[PDB]
Design a protein around this nucleic acid. Structure first.
Ligand code: CA
Ligand code: CA
Ligand code: CA
Ligand code: CA
Lengths: 154, 152
DNA sequence: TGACCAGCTGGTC
DNA sequence: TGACCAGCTGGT
């Protein structure tokens, strides 16, 4: 019905090829949970996806939590819609990989070690107990903090 | 390795993203943008700038839902379903888009009339459950197909 | 920002 | 088949 549709059809074959490339890499839907972006991070860093929980591992066995952000829209990294010590429990264990995008375009990739994150885990932990054991609705990690505390791996 | 293929494939992927922006979709890889765009272009609907999602030329607003029947057979509704969520939901028809991976299979339409069955269920359960939010109660594709108007 | 608000979904017994 | 269990985020 909408005319632009024929353009989508011309494009679609290549899109399907990208999906195949993502499927070849453990991602089954490039349009789900940022699959399309996650692939970019994997192919660049040489990390592999893990089939909930940690998101990836390197050839050394190290597992990681991976995060994305569209700098064209926001500056604070999302974490979890219901943060609490149990969620912070999983997080504290592995280093994180933060990817920065301008839309779907990969800008950079930083890597923070658990130590680089205690600060926020402590804040959230502190606020948790205090607020009367009330979950925190997606607290954010500034892109600035990531850039100044992580290691630019890309 | 495969990084090359991705780089080759990229110009097009970027066109699709340009095409989505044009149609009010910020990221094709976020919140299923790439798929929302497919439905808009087929149905001819227009996105809405996060309650209702699209609207027709007549000005009728819709709640739009998607699914990969390769993985699941139940439509997600809301992670924290409560009588407020429901109150709004009750105001507009729904567009259900069925997919096989990234391949759009079909699209259906449901009137609030045809969803009141589930609204009542969640509401009653919410109230009698001690006012506890329901964690993403699902609407079966079989229900959608049997009570909805195929529009694709 | 710190802190509130609010989206899109799959997985399973 | 209902009812629980979880994930990816942006907006102010
Ligand atoms: Ca995770
Ligand atoms: Ca993540
Ligand atoms: Ca909505
Ligand atoms: Ca929707």
């Amino acid at each position: 019905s909408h005319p632009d549709l024929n353009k989508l059809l011309e494009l679609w074959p290549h899109i399907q090829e990208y999906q195949d490339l993502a499927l070849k890499h453990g991602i089954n839907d490039i349009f789900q949970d940022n699959g399309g972006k996650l692939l970019q991070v994997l192919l660049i860093t040489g990390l592999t996806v893990l089939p909930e929980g940690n998101d990836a591992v390197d050839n050394a066995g190290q597992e990681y939590e991976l995060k994305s952000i569209n700098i064209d829209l926001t500056k604070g990294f999302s974490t979890h819609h219901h943060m609490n010590p149990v969620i912070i429990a999983k997080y504290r264990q592995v280093p994180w990989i933060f990817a920065i995008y301008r839309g779907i375009a990969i800008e950079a990739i930083y890597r923070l070690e658990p130590k680089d994150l205690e600060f926020y885990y402590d804040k959230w932990e502190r606020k948790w107990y205090s607020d009367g054991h009330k979950d925190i609705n997606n607290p954010k990690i500034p892109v600035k903090y990531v850039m100044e505390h992580g290691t630019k791996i890309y």
